[PDB]
Design a protein around this ligand. Structure first.
Ligand SMILES: [Cl-]
Ligand SMILES: [Cl-]
Length: 162
């Protein structure tokens, strides 16, 4: 198991524009297009992302190409962020994957809001960080996904994904 397989499980794959769990136009493997309520706005963001006239539909290669860019962008967003980077550097490889999953889903700024959790993660107080991570809109809106990521942070294993 690795970050790509983890995110592929949590996000799924859809080859046509769909609304994510918040109601936002999305495509592929969790690639958010726009928060605007306009499907035309989504279609135009999509053509721009892919570099051709898609009419709301993409291929698997194309979905997987966006996914690669989004994973890379998430990693690079952690390393450039002064609150996230030291926590990430402190973590082992499995728990690093959990951090990237979070940034991927909610963005670098959203995760950097988990100040107390981030500090407990840096100190390797895993049960405590797991409890605190769950006191969140994130956990309450997407509890099954949030439970899998939390378990990953708690145990440093892939058990929640097997
Ligand atoms: Cl893009
Ligand atoms: Cl969920």
């Amino acid at each position: 198991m690795n970050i790509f397989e983890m995110l592929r499980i949590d996000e799924g794959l859809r080859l046509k524009i769909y609304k994510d769990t918040e109601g936002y136009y999305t495509i592929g493997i969790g690639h958010l297009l726009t928060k605007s309520p306009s499907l035309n706005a989504a279609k135009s963001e999509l053509d721009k992302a892919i570099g051709r006239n898609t009419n709301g539909v993409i291929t698997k290669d194309e979905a997987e190409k966006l996914f690669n860019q989004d994973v890379d962008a998430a990693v690079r967003g952690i390393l450039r962020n002064a609150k996230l980077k030291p926590v990430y550097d402190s973590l082992d490889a499995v728990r690093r994957a959990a951090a990237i999953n979070m940034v991927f889903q909610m963005g670098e700024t959203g995760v950097a809001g988990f100040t107390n959790s981030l500090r407990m993660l840096q100190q390797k107080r895993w049960d405590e960080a797991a409890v605190n991570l769950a006191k969140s809109r994130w956990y309450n809106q997407t509890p099954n996904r949030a439970k899998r990521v939390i378990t990953t942070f708690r145990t440093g294993t892939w058990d929640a994904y097997k």
